[PDB]
Amino acid sequence: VNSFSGYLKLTDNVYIKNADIVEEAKKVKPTVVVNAANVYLKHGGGVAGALNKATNNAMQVESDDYIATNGPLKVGGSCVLSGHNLAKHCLHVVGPNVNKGEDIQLLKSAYENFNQHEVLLAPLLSAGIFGADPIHSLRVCVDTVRTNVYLAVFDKNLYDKLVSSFL
């Protein structure tokens, strides 16, 4: 049993809810919240800017030190950093940004990072400002992630489309 509430079940391991991932984090304090990161961990808008704002910029300060030491992530890659006031850990995952020309095949690689964590609160990767058509992205999450993932989708019309459309 876990603390996630109101989520609708899609599969054995994937659950979905209309909610802001940041609000899901403050209430649940999950072990892992996933950030929709870029390779520079520059948390400017969407999931990353909203998560970072909720940490009072502590996520950005920590991320700048990580990049200064390690250099940029790979598209499709991830790193584990603090969850600050939102979660124990934040898994920063880089889905491909269609609005920068990145190979959408890298979306499966991105979601494979989730399998290193037994339970996660996450957004749909490469959705929103990353330019990623959402049905494919969900078909990839369900077909890739084997661990227990609680998806918070902020746009109700998109939630509606996905929940009303998931095969």
> What's the longest Cα–Cα distance across the chain?
45
Cβ proximity to ligand W5P, 17 vs 117, nearer residue: 17
Q: In this chain, which stretch among 45-53, 84-92, 101-109, 141-149 interacts with ligand W5P, using CB under 6 A?
A: 45-53
By CB under 6 A, tell whether 162 contacts ligand W5P.
no
Structure tokens at 65: 């030190």
Which residue number has the CB closest to ligand W5P? 128
By the 8 A CB rule, do 149 and 115 touch? no
Name 48's Cβ contacts closer than 8 Å, sequence gap at least 6.
35, 36, 37, 38, 42
Sole window of 1-9, 69-77, 80-88, 147-155 interacting with ligand W5P (rule: CB under 6 A): 147-155
- The residue length of the chain stands at 167
Contact residues: ligand W5P, CB under 6 A: 20-22, 46-47, 50, 123-124, 127-128, 152-155, 158
